[PDB]
Amino acid sequence: GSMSIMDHSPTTGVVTVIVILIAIAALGALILGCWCYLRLQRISQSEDEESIVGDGETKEPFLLVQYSAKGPCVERKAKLMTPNGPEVHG
């Protein structure tokens, strides 16, 4: 039974996914503002945003899981090989 508010509701889950979503959006914004959501991923000087329209939701849900898996796989291999922290390097 809920106690006036909704303690017996998945509010902790809705808040957890909203915080994670807010964090993902904030991270995406940080990458869009600091690297135009491109960060020199290829020849550059022509490529557009690679995450939602450049690659992610442009066609079919395939790019979604593709970016959902490679995004972190690339970000991890990029952070493991390079500093990826503009506070000290590119």
Side-chain angles (χ1 to χ4, degrees), residues 19-73:
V19 167
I20 289 297
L21 273 163
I22 281 168
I24 287 168
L27 168 129
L30 269 157
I31 288 180
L32 182 141
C34 233
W35 284 316
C36 267
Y37 234 138
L38 170 81
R39 195 199 86 272
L40 241 117
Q41 213 105 276
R42 232 131 312 141
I43 239 283
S44 191
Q45 279 216 124
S46 266
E47 293 178 284
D48 206 89
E49 170 251 277
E50 185 179 86
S51 193
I52 304 150
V53 69
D55 180 357
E57 258 195 319
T58 333
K59 188 179 186 275
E60 265 100 55
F62 220 92
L63 291 160
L64 224 131
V65 296
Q66 207 206 99
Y67 207 99
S68 187
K70 92 176 126 181
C73 224

